[PDB]
Design an enzyme around this catalytic site. Structure first.
Site, short mmCIF file in Angstrom:
data_model
loop_
_atom_site.label_atom_id
_atom_site.label_comp_id
_atom_site.label_asym_id
_atom_site.label_seq_id
_atom_site.Cartn_x
_atom_site.Cartn_y
_atom_site.Cartn_z
N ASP A 230 -18.45 -4.07 59.99
CA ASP A 230 -19.71 -4.93 59.96
C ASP A 230 -20.91 -4.57 59.20
O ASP A 230 -20.53 -3.79 58.15
CB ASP A 230 -20.36 -4.76 61.69
N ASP B 23 -19.83 -2.51 65.52
CA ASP B 23 -21.15 -3.34 65.66
C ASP B 23 -21.93 -2.21 66.18
O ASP B 23 -22.83 -1.90 65.28
CB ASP B 23 -20.93 -4.36 66.83
N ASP C 253 -16.50 -9.13 60.62
CA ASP C 253 -17.46 -9.67 61.73
C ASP C 253 -18.09 -10.99 60.60
O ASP C 253 -18.80 -10.41 59.89
CB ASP C 253 -18.36 -8.83 62.15
N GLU D 112 -25.92 -8.20 53.23
CA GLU D 112 -24.83 -8.18 54.26
C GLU D 112 -23.42 -8.24 53.36
O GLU D 112 -22.64 -8.05 54.12
CB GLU D 112 -24.82 -9.66 54.87
#
Ligand SMILES: [Mg+2]
Ligand SMILES: [Mg+2]
Ligand SMILES: [Mg+2]
Length: 660
Positions: free
Chosen positions: A459, A635, A524, A490
């Site tokens: 993630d 996460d 993710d 990201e």
DNA sequence: TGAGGTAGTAGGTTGT
RNA sequence: CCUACUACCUC
């Protein structure tokens, strides 16, 4: 295994495109001054929007479902200061082929524009983006709650419109940030300027005068000069925040907590009704709800020392591999010594498990300062591995400080709120599971045969301008985490993914006596183009096989049973190399949408493993997480590191799960 | 800070 | 697609 059923999803099949819609009008664009190599997509698209009608962007031009003679083929668009002028030229009509992926893409574009351009001109109500609101669920004094469907209309392979429906509410208020405050309502946590659309975090009211306020001109004069104080009447002051900033007749409130989920069955009903309505009023035919076949999947064999239905039961049966360990107690409240029951409960679990445990007690306090840190050094040195913190609800800031401090001593910590009572079973029973996971114990494990021996999840952090890319392995069909890497966005750097992965390979190697045969890679959300390039390359060479899978929480739409109950653990194959999963069971379930990004494993097989990993989560207790253990673990790791810094994780055992 | 879910509210990844 | 927070429910 494959207890087959049939459930339809919240999509609908509608009339096939007519001949005209397959031959969209082609136009050419002449914008002078000519845009920059970089300022095109956002500009060339806002020109179509400007041109009117149901038109979309067609590569280096535009494409329309409207006769040129009803478009604005000339005008002038403005973007970021510069005012470039445009000019459209009608240039024929090219046939499009839905059978082709590239061609169908733009047709679906037109279709969404159609849905928007036709819904806006209905005697109905608002149309906020892809959303639509027919009725009103409530109309209190100061607030209004309208209800809606959020929609999408695209084109399929066969060339028929597809209309995806999903009910949704909206909270909209009318009263000013003053009339609403005078109406008798507490101060909101979010405010949005009524001249602009930017919002703020309303901190307090100002004990200052509007006119006599010193700005960086005069506060009341600033909004006056900008012609914002016309047709209205600015009230008192208000300290919004990004450091305060003066600003309440101009501000508006953002309602959220102040002033009901749709029942499972009562949702699928409104879903079809909105469909019949959108196809009847738009001339798209009778909605044929698209059905699909599902598969009830094998029940997970979660096992402590003896098989068990949920991690919480592992406390009376025993742990899967409990080693000798000692915990500690830290009371930030009044009293001293472990509560009677929390002790009885731990000794039992470790009795069953067979491993011996020793409870300690920290007779220190944070306020002592550095005297306190050595109280920890000594605890750890005496063999303590984790500490339970009994403290009245703390503040976010005080919480992270204490968490981060102990971590700097290599002691994960599980917080528990002092207002505690024996009969709060779930509460403290989970507190224990969370402590024990953090101590380094394997509460439960999985009994069964799985295609992959290693499962890792990736993630990305949050908050500040930068994030933390992070991953966490799961050795053999024990869990552990790796040192994260701070990144810009990201997308996880290509060699960062690899190095992170390599760590889990080598972790597995440490536990077993051999590199894994096959690994299950779970990312993710969407997997940015080629962010796993370098990773999969290596695995190949090293002779270890793999499977990449996008795990997406959003976009799984809904899924309703043709009749009867909705079974837990449905495997709903969709297109090629893409399927659903309803991994959990008050409201209406949001299925995960998985996408096989690389590898040669049968989707049925992946779905199986993924679903099973669900029940591997330690501090879950009486309920299992929606996604796989590794992805759920990555996460939280990523979340806590970003929350309270990476600097503390230095002296923390990777087998200890401090973030849970 | 018991944890899981779904449901709102914002703001906004990547790559149009 | 994701990143957060808040509120309700449940064991
Ligand atoms: Mg993510
Ligand atoms: Mg996440
Ligand atoms: Mg926890």
């Amino acid at each position: 295994h494959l207890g087959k059923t049939e459930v339809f999803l919240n999509r609908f099949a509608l009339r096939p495109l007519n001949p005209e819609e397959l031959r969209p009008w082609r136009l050419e664009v002449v914008l002078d001054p000519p845009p920059g190599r970089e300022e095109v997509y956002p500009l060339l698209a806002q020109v179509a929007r400007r041109a009117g009608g149901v038109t979309v962007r067609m590569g280096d031009g535009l494409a329309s479902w409207s006769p040129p003679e009803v478009l604005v083929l000339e005008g002038t668009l403005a973007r970021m200061g510069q005012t470039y002028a445009y000019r459209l030229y009608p240039k024929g009509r090219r046939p499009l082929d839905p059978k082709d992926p590239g061609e169908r893409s733009v047709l679906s574009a037109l279709a969404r524009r159609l849905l928007q351009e036709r819904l806006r001109r209905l005697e109905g109500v608002w149309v906020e983006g892809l959303a639509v609101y027919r009725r009103e669920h409530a109309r209190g004094p100061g607030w209004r709650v309208l209800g809606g469907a959020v929609l999408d209309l695209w084109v399929s392979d066969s060339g028929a419109f597809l209309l995806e429906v999903d009910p949704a509410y909206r909270i909209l208020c009318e009263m000013s940030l003053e009339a609403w405050l005078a109406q008798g309502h507490p101060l909101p946590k979010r405010v949005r300027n009524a001249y602009d659309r930017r919002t703020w975090e309303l901190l307090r009211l100002g004990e200052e005068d509007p006119k006599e306020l010193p700005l960086p001109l005069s506060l009341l004069d600033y909004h006056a000069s900008k012609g914002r104080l016309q047709g209205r009447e600015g009230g008192r002051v208000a300290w919004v925040a990004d450091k305060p900033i003066p600003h309440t007749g101009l501000l508006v409130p953002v309602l959220t907590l102040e002033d009901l989920s749709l029942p499972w069955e009562e949702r699928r009903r409104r879903t079809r009704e909105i469909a019949s309505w959108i196809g009847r009023r738009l001339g798209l035919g009778t909605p044929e709800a698209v059905r699909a076949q599902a598969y009830r999947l094998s029940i997970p064999k979660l096992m402590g020392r003896r098989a068990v239905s949920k991690p919480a039961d592992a406390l009376r049966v025993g742990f899967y591999r409990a080693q000798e360990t000692a915990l500690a107690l830290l009371r930030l409240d009044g009293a001293q010594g472990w509560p009677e029951f929390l002790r009885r409960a731990l000794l039992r679990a470790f009795g069953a498990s067979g491993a011996s445990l020793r409870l300690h007690t920290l007779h220190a306090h944070p306020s002592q300062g550095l005297a306190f840190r050595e109280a920890l050094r000594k605890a750890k040195e005496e063999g303590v591995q984790a500490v339970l913190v009994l403290t009245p609800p703390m503040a976010w800031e005080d919480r992270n400080r204490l968490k981060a401090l102990l971590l700097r001593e290599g002691l994960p910590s599980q917080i528990l709120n002092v207002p505690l009572r024996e009969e709060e079973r779930h509460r403290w029973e989970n507190a224990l599971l969370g402590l024990l996971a953090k101590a380094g114990l394997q509460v439960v494990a999985l009994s069964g045969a799985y295609p992959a021996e290693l499962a890792v999840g990736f993630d990305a952090g949050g908050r500040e301008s930068f994030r933390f890319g992070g991953a966490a392995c799961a050795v053999g069909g024990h869990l552990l985490w790796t040192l994260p890497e701070a990144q810009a966005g990201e997308r996880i750097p290509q060699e960062v993914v690899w190095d992170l992965l390599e760590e889990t390979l080598w972790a597995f190697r440490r536990k077993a006596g051999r590199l894994p045969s096959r690994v299950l890679l779970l990312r993710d959300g969407r997997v940015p183009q080629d962010e796993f390039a370098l990773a999969l390359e290596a695995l190949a060479r090293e002779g270890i096989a793999y499977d990449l899978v996008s795990v997406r929480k959003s976009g799984g739409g809904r899924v309703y049973p043709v009749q009867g109950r909705l079974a837990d653990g449905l495997y709903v194959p969709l297109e090629d190399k893409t399927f659903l999963l309803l991994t959990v069971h008050r409201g209406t379930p949001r299925p995960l949408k998985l996408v096989h990004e690389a590898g040669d494993t049968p989707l049925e097989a992946l779905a199986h493993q993924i679903f099973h990993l669900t029940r591997l989560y330690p501090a879950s207790g009486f309920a299992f997480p929606r996604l796989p253990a590794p992805l759920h673990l990555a996460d939280r790791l990523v979340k806590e590191v970003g929350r309270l810094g990476i600097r503390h994780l230095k002296e923390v055992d990777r087998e200890k799960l401090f973030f849970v």
